């Protein structure tokens, strides 16, 4: 194994995470990534996004009762990435058919009549780059909206417009 | 695009930056990363270190006369890389003789009696494997804190004595 | 609700083909058949086969990194079908114009300079006979040479000759 | 040193190509070089050469029906390099993935058992020393057989034997 200062992503304990019980390992490597939005509330600033994204995990984990957060990985307009179930772990973000054999990352809000900053695309990113240097996804990796996978207006159609554009993007 | 990975760096016109006039360029691979500090207000959210990143250029351009902010890259407390003179371009940061034969960086804010919380110290730690991936630093290079290369109290004591503790870090 | 059985085709589990990562899907029925070769040798009996199967799918994927073999039917010269992605998977074949509205059936052999035994054409054809019964393939779908969608040798010239005479091959 | 120091490539024009009508762009400095084989006959002489491009072209744009010949530049046995979609167009050689991310080049000959001439060979080098020297290709490009990313047999086996001994071979 090889693995590299890959990126930068704020951990787990940084955005107060509840621990997680979350058990099921993904197959490295992986070859899809979705793309999500939460629908939720917007954040621009690092104290403004670490607590959405604990809210975005104390309501998949209170409400949803899973193990953990069900994105791998959520996105912040603070042009930050934020740690869920991480490379290793299998996610609840896309359904029994694509949790298994996915990588699901989530930007934070509601993406209908907005954009998200070039920030937020460039960590985006530049998280699935080092998924690569790291070896969690594979180098032919291909990213699918949420929209593509399962009947739902996530990732929603301002983001899901400008994710048709990626190289890695195959629908 | 593309791919406009990696680091995820601000890029000059994101924080509304003057435009660069500087043509000396970097003999490289480079050996030597100097970190700094601005001595300058801190910033954290990402509005304000693009303010703050603009204040300190226009204080090098209009008043030093400068052709450009004189740092090869800058750190906000915001969690991000701002792009300065970048990889190629010679910087102005740590006197004539290591600013040929190092990359400059410099965290924004005055680190005498704090601490650059952690995004902004992971930034700054990919930042640099971002730039050995690229060529630009040499696999091993040194970081030297500017108080070991110039007679300055940057880049702040606590920040220094966090540096010291960097594998990269020789004195 | 009734039954027509067609399949005289051996199943992926049978050859020990490893597992699909495909998710992609034809939309039935589907107008076009693609004929290629692998241009691999070519194997007489259901043992070899087999056998070749595997090696064809481990170049595609072991090799290449696609998600499965990328015919969705092989064809032997021991007179039988190997099971590719089959009818409801776009396989990989003839391109991205092509690939996702037709089907890509490839005999397993070089056809440059000798034709395919009378049993792989009876193959072939009762293929075909076979996906318009069930819905696969429109009644009057439309055979291609590879060649003729894509800059390549295949099917090979003998084989292409008499491809080019079949009732249902489209210039 | 000087602004333009590189190669000789006989022009569109020169080997009397029709029109290109390809509009979709490479991001220069691009990093692949994908090299494939025509499978056709092979030419020695400037007059044959020319002639040769000029019949690979038309099979690709009047019976594939392409904006232009496939390739972005042909080398003939002549030891001339043959100006096709060049440096700038994305071609249509090794598909999806590997087409708007590379620059293929095609040996027009067979060489499955027969290699190209040395001055050939030059020709090929000489073309990609060039493609740096413009900032066409990255200074660290790498070259793959169309064979290491699609699967054929091109670009035949003498000729992939010699690939894969250059500077800048990538399996
Ligand atoms: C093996 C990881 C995949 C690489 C993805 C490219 C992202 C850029 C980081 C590496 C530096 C490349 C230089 C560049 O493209 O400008």
Redesign the interface.
Same mark, same amino acid.
């Given at each position: 194994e090889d693995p =590299?200062?890959?990126?930068? *992503?704020?951990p787990r304990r940084?955005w107060r995470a509840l621990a997680s019980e979350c058990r099921e390992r993904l197959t490295r490597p992986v070859?899809y990534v979705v793309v999500s939005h939460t629908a939720g509330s917007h954040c %621009?600033?690092? @104290?403004s996004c670490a607590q959405q994204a604990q809210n975005v995990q104390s309501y998949h984990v209170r409400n949803l009762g899973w193990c953990d957060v069900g994105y791998n990985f959520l996105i912040g307009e %603070?042009?930050?990435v934020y740690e869920g179930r991480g490379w290793n772990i299998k996610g609840a973000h896309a359904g029994p $058919?694509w949790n298994p *054999?996915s990588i699901g990352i989530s930007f934070m809000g509601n993406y209908m009549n907005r954009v998200p900053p =070039?920030?937020a695309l460039? @960590?985006a990113? +530049?998280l699935l @780059?080092?998924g690569v240097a790291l070896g969690a996804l594979?180098? +032919?990796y291909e990213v699918k909206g949420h929209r593509d996978?399962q009947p739902t207006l996530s990732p929603g159609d301002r983001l899901y417009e400008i994710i048709q $554009?990626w190289?890695h993007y195959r629908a």
């Open positions: =590299p200062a890959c990126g930068s *992503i704020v940084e070859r %621009d600033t690092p @104290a %603070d042009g930050l $058919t *054999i =070039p920030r460039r @960590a990113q +530049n @780059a080092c594979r180098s +032919n996978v $554009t190289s």
